[PDB]
Structure formats: C-alpha cells, structure tokens
Amino acid sequence: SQVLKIRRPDDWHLHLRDGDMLKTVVPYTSEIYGRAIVMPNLAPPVTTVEAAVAYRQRILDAVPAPHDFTPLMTCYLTDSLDPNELERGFNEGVFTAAKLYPANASHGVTSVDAIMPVLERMEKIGMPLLVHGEVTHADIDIFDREARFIESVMEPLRQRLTALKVVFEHITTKDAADYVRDGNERLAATITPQHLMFNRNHMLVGGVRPHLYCLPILKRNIHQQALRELVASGFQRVFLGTDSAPHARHRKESSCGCAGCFNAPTALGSYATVFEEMNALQHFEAFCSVNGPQFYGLPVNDTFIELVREEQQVAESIALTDDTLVPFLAGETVRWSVK
Amino acid sequence: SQVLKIRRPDDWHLHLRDGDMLKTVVPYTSEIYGRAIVMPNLAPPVTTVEAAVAYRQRILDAVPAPHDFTPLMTCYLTDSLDPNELERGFNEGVFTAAKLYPANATTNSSHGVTSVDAIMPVLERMEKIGMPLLVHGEVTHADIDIFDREARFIESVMEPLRQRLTALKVVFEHITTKDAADYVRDGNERLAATITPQHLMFNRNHMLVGGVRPHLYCLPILKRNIHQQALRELVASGFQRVFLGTDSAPHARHRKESSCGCAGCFNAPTALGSYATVFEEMNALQHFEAFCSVNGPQFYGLPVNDTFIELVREEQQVAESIALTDDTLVPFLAGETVRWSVK
Ligand SMILES: NC(=O)N[C@@H](CC(=O)O)C(=O)O
Ligand SMILES: NC(=O)N[C@@H](CC(=O)O)C(=O)O
Ligand SMILES: O=C(O)c1cc(=O)[nH]c(=O)[nH]1
Ligand SMILES: [Zn+2]
Ligand SMILES: [Zn+2]
Ligand SMILES: [Zn+2]
Ligand SMILES: [Zn+2]
Numbered sequence: 001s002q003v004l005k006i007r008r009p010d011d012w013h014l015h016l017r018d019g020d021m022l023k024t025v026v027p028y029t030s031e032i033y034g035r036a037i038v039m040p041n042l043a044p045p046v047t048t049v050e051a052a053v054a055y056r057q058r059i060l061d062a063v064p065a066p067h068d069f070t071p072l073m074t075c076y077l078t079d080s081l082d083p084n085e086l087e088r089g090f091n092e093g094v095f096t097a098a099k100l101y102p103a104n105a106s107h108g109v110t111s112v113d114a115i116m117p118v119l120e121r122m123e124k125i126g127m128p129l130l131v132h133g134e135v136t137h138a139d140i141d142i143f144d145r146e147a148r149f150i151e152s153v154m155e156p157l158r159q160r161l162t163a164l165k166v167v168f169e170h171i172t173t174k175d176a177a178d179y180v181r182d183g184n185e186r187l188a189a190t191i192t193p194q195h196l197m198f199n200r201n202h203m204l205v206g207g208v209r210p211h212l213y214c215l216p217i218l219k220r221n222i223h224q225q226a227l228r229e230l231v232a233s234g235f236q237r238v239f240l241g242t243d244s245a246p247h248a249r250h251r252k253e254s255s256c257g258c259a260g261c262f263n264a265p266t267a268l269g270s271y272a273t274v275f276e277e278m279n280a281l282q283h284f285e286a287f288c289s290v291n292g293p294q295f296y297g298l299p300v301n302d303t304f305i306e307l308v309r310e311e312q313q314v315a316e317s318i319a320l321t322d323d324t325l326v327p328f329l330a331g332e333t334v335r336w337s338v339k
Numbered sequence: 340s341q342v343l344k345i346r347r348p349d350d351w352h353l354h355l356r357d358g359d360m361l362k363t364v365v366p367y368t369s370e371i372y373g374r375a376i377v378m379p380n381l382a383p384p385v386t387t388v389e390a391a392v393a394y395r396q397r398i399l400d401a402v403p404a405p406h407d408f409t410p411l412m413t414c415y416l417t418d419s420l421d422p423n424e425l426e427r428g429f430n431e432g433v434f435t436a437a438k439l440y441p442a443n444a445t446t447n448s449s450h451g452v453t454s455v456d457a458i459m460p461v462l463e464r465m466e467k468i469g470m471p472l473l474v475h476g477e478v479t480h481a482d483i484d485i486f487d488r489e490a491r492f493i494e495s496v497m498e499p500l501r502q503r504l505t506a507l508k509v510v511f512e513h514i515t516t517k518d519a520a521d522y523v524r525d526g527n528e529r530l531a532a533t534i535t536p537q538h539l540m541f542n543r544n545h546m547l548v549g550g551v552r553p554h555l556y557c558l559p560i561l562k563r564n565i566h567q568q569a570l571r572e573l574v575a576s577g578f579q580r581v582f583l584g585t586d587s588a589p590h591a592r593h594r595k596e597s598s599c600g601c602a603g604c605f606n607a608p609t610a611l612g613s614y615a616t617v618f619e620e621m622n623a624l625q626h627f628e629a630f631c632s633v634n635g636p637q638f639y640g641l642p643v644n645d646t647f648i649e650l651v652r653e654e655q656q657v658a659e660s661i662a663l664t665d666d667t668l669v670p671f672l673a674g675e676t677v678r679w680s681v682k
Contacts, residue, residue, distance in 0.1 A: 141563050142547050204485050204560060207599035213551040220484055253596050255669065256550035326598065 002309035003339070004272060004281065008301035009288035011036035011267075013130075013169055013190045013241025015260070016059060016071070018042050020321045025246050026062045028264035030069035032338060034301040037130070037241070040076035040099055045107055047076050049089030056094070068303075072096040074130060078107050079114040083121040090127050096296070097167070098122060099130040102149075112157055119161055128165040128296065133176065134216050146216050147175040154179070158187070167295070170195065170243045172216045174226035181235055188295045190241025191227055193270035194261050194328065199224040210257040211326055214245065231287060232278035239291035242267045248323040263328035266314060269336035270329065272307050276336075305338065312337035341652040343615060343624070343679065347644040348631040350375040350610075352473070352512055352533045352584030354603070355398060355410070357381055359664045364589055365401040367607040369408035371681060373644040376473070376584070379415035379438055384450060386415050388428035395433075411435035413473065418448040418457050422464040429470050435639070436471045436510075437461075441479045441492075455500055466507040471639060473510045476519070477559055489559050490518040497522070501530070510638070513538065513586045515559045517569030524578055531638045533584020534570055536613035537604050537671065542567040553600035554669055557588065574630055575623035582634035585610045591666040606671035609657055612679040613672070615650050619679075648681065655680040
C-alpha cells in the first residue's frame with residue numbers, strides 16, 4: 001500500500017510534436033510535470049526565437065486549464081545558425097537551451113567547427129548544450145555510435161569549450177555512464193525509462209517490437225546494468241528526461257518503423273519501479289525533481305505529488321484524430337501509479 | 340547483357356508453410372529449383388512419416404503443371420519422437436533429413452527437444468542409418484544476448500555433439516557469424532553449412548539504421564558487418580561445404596508489420612539473383628554454380644541436376660507485394676531494381 005511522496009518532477013527531455021499530435025500528447029506531461037525541456041526537432045525545425053515563441057504558444061493553448069505546466073523551449077542548432085539568434089531568444093527567456101543533433105538526413109550539425117562560434121556564445125552566456133551523442137558514419141555499426149561519439153566528439157568538444165555546460169541526452173551505454181560519472185560539474189546526463197527497463201533482447205527476442213525501437217538504440221544488458229547502477233548510486237549529475245517521442249501506430253508498425261517511445265503516460269511509475277528494484281527509493285526524488293533544476297540553475301518545484309504502489313494497468317492505445325497512439329507498456333501492468 | 344547459365348539449382352533450406360499460403364508460395368520455388376529441403380515447422384510440427392507423406396502430397400498438388408519439382412521432407416526432432424519412426428521414414432525415402440530446433444526447457448515434448456542428451460537415442464539412430472542432421476544453431480537462454488546465440492551454440496552444443504556422434508553428417512543451417520564460418524571451414528567432410536541471401540547481402544545496420552525494418556528481421560538475427568564479411572569470404576573462397584539454403588520463410592504482411600513482427604524473409608522469388616549479385620561483387624562467379632547446384636547434392640549424396648537455367652544480367656524491378664487470399668506478402672527486396680534475373 002506504499003505511497004511515495006515526492007516534490008513535483010520535471011521532464012528534462014521531451015518531444016511534443018505539433019498540431020493534433022501536440023494537442024493529444026501534452027496533457028500526459030502537463031498533468032504531472034512542472035516543467036519540461038521541449039525538443040526543437042519539428043519540421044521544419046525551430047531555429048528562430050520567433051518560431052520558438054509561436055510553438056511555445058501552441059503548447060500553452062493545449063495545456064489543460066488546471067495544470068501548472070511550463071514548457072522550456074530549445075533551439076535547433078544548425079551549421080549556419082546566427083549566434084545572435086541564440087542570445088536574443090536566450091536573453092528574452094525564449095530559449096533555455098540549444099540541442100545538437102548530429103547530421104543525418106537532416107539539418108543537424110555537419111561539424112563542431114562549422115558551429116564553433118555558436119558554441120562559444122553559449123559558453124559565454126552560460127547556455128547549456130543538449131547533445132544527442134551519436135556519430136553517423138554509414139559504416140559505423142549502430143550499436144557503436146554512442147561510444148564513438150565520446151572520443152571523437154564529446155571530449156574534444158569539452159576540452160575546447162572548458163566552461164561549456166553540457167547535457168549528454170538519453171545515455172544508453174556503460175561507456176557513457178562512466179564518462180559522465182567521471183566528468184566535471186559542467187557535464188550531466190538524462191536517462192529514459194526504456195533504457196533502464198530493457199535491453200536489446202527485449203526488442204528482438206520472440207519478435208521485433210517497434211514500440212521498443214528508439215534512438216539511441218537499446219543496447220546489450222551490460223549497458224543497461226551500468227545505467228541502472230548509475231542512477232541507483234545517487235550520482236547527482238543524472239536526471240529524468242523521458243525522451244517521450246510519439247508516433248502514430250502505423251508509422252511505428254510499418255515496413256520502416258519510426259524511432260521513439262511514447263512513454264509520457266508511464267515514465268514516472270516506470271522510473272519508480274526501477275529505483276525500488278535497485279533498492280534506491282532514497283535517490284528517487286532527486287533524480288526526478290532536484291538534479292535537473294540544479295544543473296539548470298532553476299529552482300525546484302514547490303509542489304508535491306504522490307505515487308501509490310498499486311498495480312495499475314496501461315491502455316492498449318490512445319486515440320488520435322487519425323490512427324492511434326500506442327503507449328509505452330501498452331496493455332501491460334505497472335506497479336506504481338500516480339494518485 | 341551477360342548470361343549466366345548453371346545447372347538447375349536446389350534450395351537446401353526452405354519453409355513452404357501450408358494451406359493457402361503454401362499454394363501461393365510453392366510456384367516461386369518450383370519454377371526454379373529442382374529439389375528443396377522442406378522444413379517441418381508446421382503447426383503442429385511434422386513428426387511422423389504419415390504427416391510427412393500427406394504434407395509432401397499437398398506440396399505436389401500446388402506445383403504448377405510444367406514445373407519438375409521434388410520436395411525433400413524432413414522430420415522435426417522432439418523428445419518424444421520414436422527413433423523407429425524416424426528410421427522408417429528415412430528407410431522409405433520419406434524423410435531426407437531431420438531438423439533440430441533450439442531446445443527450450445519450457446517446450447512441450449511433442450513440439451521440441453528439452454536438451455540434446457534427451458534425444459540421444461534419436462541421434463544415434465541417425466548416425467547409424469547415415470541420416471543427415473540439420474541444425475538451427477542457437478542457444479535460447481534468456482540470459483543470452485540475441486547476437487551471441489549462434490557463437491554460444493558452437494561451444495556449448497555443436498562441438499560436443501559432434502564429439503559424441505563422430506559419424507553423424509551435420510548441416511549448420513543458415514550461418515550468420517564469422518564464428519560459424521571459421522568453424523565450418525575448418526571442419527571435417529561430415530560438416531557443411533547453408534547461407535541465406537539476406538545474410539550475405541546485409542548486416543544489422545540495414546535492419547536498424549534509419550528505421551526498424553521488419554522485412555529484414557529473421558532468425559538467426561543479422562549480425563555486425565564483420566560477420567557479413569566473413570560469410571561473403573566463405574562463399575567466395577570456393578569452399579565446397581557451403582551451399583544454397585534460402586531460408587525463405589514467408590509471413591503475411593500484417594504479421595510482419597505489427598507490434599511484434601514475425602521473423603522471416605520471403606526470399607524465394609529473388610534469392611537466386613541476389614546470390615549471383617553477391618558472387619559477382621566478390622569476383623567469385625566461378626564458384627556460383629557449385630554453391631547453387633553441386634555442393635549440396637554432393638553433401639547429401641544426391642545426383643547433381645541434369646537441366647540448366649539461365650540468369651541474365653538485365654535490370655529488373657521486384658514486385659511491391661504478392662497477393663494472398665486475405666493479405667499480401669512482401670518479397671525480399673520488394674520494389675527494388677534487381678541486377679540479375681532468371682530468363
Ligand atoms: N543506411 C542505412 O539505412 N542503414 C545502414 C547501412 C549500412 O550500414 O550498411 C547505415 O549504416 O546507416
Ligand atoms: N529518440 C528517438 O527514438 N526518437 C526521437 C528523436 C531523438 O530523441 O533523438 C524522435 O523525435 O522521434
Ligand atoms: O519458419 C519461420 O518463420 C523461420 C524460422 C526461423 O528459424 N527463421 C526465421 O527467420 N523464420
Ligand atoms: Zn536524441
Ligand atoms: Zn529526443
Ligand atoms: Zn532456422
Ligand atoms: Zn528455417
């Protein structure tokens with residue numbers, strides 16, 4: 001009958017999409033999180049304050065009346081991005097951070113050098129850099145993209161922008177776990193519920209499960225073990241970032257399924273389970289509600305919430321204007337529930 | 340427009356399913372291959388001489404008039420299979436071989452094997468009558484990483500097993516690792532292997548980079564590029580103990596593109612051309628024919644086919660889908676433009 005009482009948490013890594021999808025999904029976040037870092041990978045992407053402003057507005061429009069939710073917008077870094085585009089939006093309180101997506105197909109970053117200036121301005125103004133740490137060379141084995149990024153990009157980057165504050169988003173490997181753990185107070189990381197709860201076997205044994213398919217790719221259990229250890233340790237430089245990344249059912253279940261788990265509805269309780277399992281409930285609240293604000297130099301939420309150890313169930317699916325949305329843990333039974 | 344004329348090939352590893360599915364898929368094999376090793380993994384499995392005979396009939400019924408095709412049946416090994424049942428079928432020319440699927444401890448006795456030791460009696464009768472054993476070499480323990488299952492089978496099951504049955508002839512089906520490749524390559528005249536076109540053409544990257552592609556999802560799972568490379572080298576080397584085994588394993592589109600996609604590539608229609616494309620790229624065309632129509636027969640102690648077939652090096656596009664009664668089937672390389680095609 002256990003109930004866990006924690007300070008309201010925040011989601012330091014979220015995809016809210018736009019339009020109809022946005023209207024449908026926000027409430028799952030808003031009804032629980034005080035704030036959330038909203039990713040800029042829209043299409044087209046959010047690379048200007050002006051865009052960031054409008055998007056922020058569309059977001060508020062969809063927030064239910066009762067919820068005190070605040071979206072923290074981010075800037076989509078591009079090779080050409082005007083560093084003054086950044087300051088501004090940053091100065092006006094538009095941008096809380098800037099996200100580095102390695103170039104894949106689309107507008108991500110070609111190279112660090114191409115954006116050196118931008119990065120310097122961020123270092124200066126004290127704007128944190130959010131990094132999707134993966135190399136993209138076609139001949140690089142997908143399971144190796146993260147580790148590779150460390151040596152070829154992360155470190156070098158850090159070594160050159162000494163006061164740069166960096167969040168290594170959704171880490172998935174022992175490599176990354178250790179690097180962060182031994183990093184400086186200017187380096188932090190986010191971890192999704194999926195990467196703590198499963199490993200590649202869960203996605204490929206007995207059938208291919210597109211709902212577990214996301215980036216960076218689920219790794220070997222060895223890696224999952226490192227992650228769980230990291231969180232359970234109390235390390236104060238790791239915090240909640242769901243990476244909730246919703247895709248309609250048929251875009252997931254197709255000949256070429258999209259990457260991303262829609263975990264907003266079940267994340268918190270999933271995280272609770274992990275911590276419990278790890279015998280680390282004492283570090284739970286910080287992960288969810290203290291570490292992030294601290295890294296970001298933001299105050300903690302002044303309100304609370306309760307989790308009840310009541311085996312609650314998960315919807316098979318969620319209605320969309322068109323098609324459905326399959327939630328993470330769909331049809332399954334969760335141990336912890338938000339009361 | 341280069342021509343590649345070869346003796347009529349054979350498919351040493353095939354899934355023809357049953358019922359309606361069987362009717363749609365047979366023709367893709369029978370049109371091309373002289374004979375094929377037909378897998379026994381039906382629901383329920385083919386574990387009796389009697390089920391084998393009836394299944395073989397259904398296959399024949401579905402072969403189009405012109406096609407000279409002979410299905411070579413197999414028995415699904417199970418803890419409860421009566422060795423004399425296995426011997427009878429073999430003696431009567433019903434069972435050409437027997438297939439060993441990974442043991443699960445949770446497996447019902449009439450659907451599988453709990454362990455190899457449990458089926459010693461069967462194996463011994465195979466060694467004794469000289470019946471070849473076809474093995475799907477993976478250890479299925481939950482604690483084992485999916486990508487490590489094949490290699491772990493080598494050390495834990497394969498070696499030992501071969502050690503206890505020295506005269507048994509064994510085919511390491513659809514090898515997907517350099518581990519397997521090296522093992523087989525350094526083995527005796529009593530050890531052979533089959534390689535699918537997908538394992539030569541792709542690696543796990545193709546299945547996971549840029550989206551998850553269930554049509555490339557099959558068992559054993561696509562491995563890292565080094566493995567793909569190892570396989571390519573093996574076929575290209577001229578090694579005569581590796582032969583064509585498509586592992587064509589069709590599933591309805593809806594069963595592939597679902598929340599839990601079934602494993603298996605429907606490659607019957609395009610396998611041959613794909614193999615040729617591989618041998619070409621490896622500059623091993625001189626070993627193409629052997630791989631397709633001589634190695635297998637020699638291993639199984641069967642005659643090499645008397646007719647020929649021809650591949651033309653003319654560009655072709657693969658259909659997007661093939662109609663089934665209640666859904667569609669997506670072929671291997673669907674919608675693509677293929678380099679070598681049958682004439
Ligand atoms: N390009 C893809 O769609 N997938 C793979 C291809 C490969 O590695 O061979 C990749 O590396 O990106
Ligand atoms: N991670 C994913 O699997 N998908 C995310 C993108 C991202 O988080 O990089 C998405 O936007 O769909
Ligand atoms: O029958 C099948 O579907 C076939 C079995 C198997 O072992 N491999 C595969 O990918 N599918
Ligand atoms: Zn990312
Ligand atoms: Zn993300
Ligand atoms: Zn198999
Ligand atoms: Zn098979």
